[PDB]
């Protein structure tokens, strides 16, 4: 069947959901919801339709102002001038990444990625999971703790009003003091692109027997 994805906004401010999909035929949504603090919404992944898989990323855009189609713009994760969908790639932000695949008996795969940035904490937790006895599958990806306070000073980004709102990886492809701090506080997420080749890493998750996922964007201020 088709998996559901529930977005839960616990950040403390409004988020404008965005998504980017791989160039493999994965079908992107016409629009993704805007969530005031505390609100939630659920979408349905069209797995049963061609091409039978969905490889892509969800993220929260923050600090959005202006008019859609004209000057709409976000302080974190901007992906174009439209409030309801991405016209371009996104500026660096926390990512919830998925590989739904009806041809992969281990899918869906999921992970939290701070490779580009840590903006808000993300957890990805399966819904109605049936874990085989002894299996450690269907784990929760990511951690709830706000990691902005542990950001190296050189990688911090501030709102015009002076609030710390983002922590941007200076080198996505090699360990840095940025990735050291992220990994030290949450080993359950990507902090740099090839972390999943480190022995003992806890970056990747899959759950072959669930009805969907809950993506929670946790408190960030």
From TrEMBL:
Record-linked SUPFAM superfamilies: Osmotin, thaumatin-like protein
Keyword Protein biosynthesis in record: no
Classification via InterPro entries: Osmotin/thaumatin-like_sf, Thaumatin
Annotated S-S bridges: 64-74, 79-86, 138-207, 143-186, 151-167
Top-rank taxon, per record: Bacteria
Keywords attached to this entry: Signal
Pfam families xref list: Thaumatin
UniProt keyword Signal present: yes
PANTHER family, sorted: THAUMATIN FAMILY PROTEIN-RELATED, THAUMATIN-LIKE PROTEIN
Protein name, entry field: Thaumatin pathogenesis-like protein
UniProt lineage: Bacteria, Bacillati, Actinomycetota, Actinomycetes, Pseudonocardiales
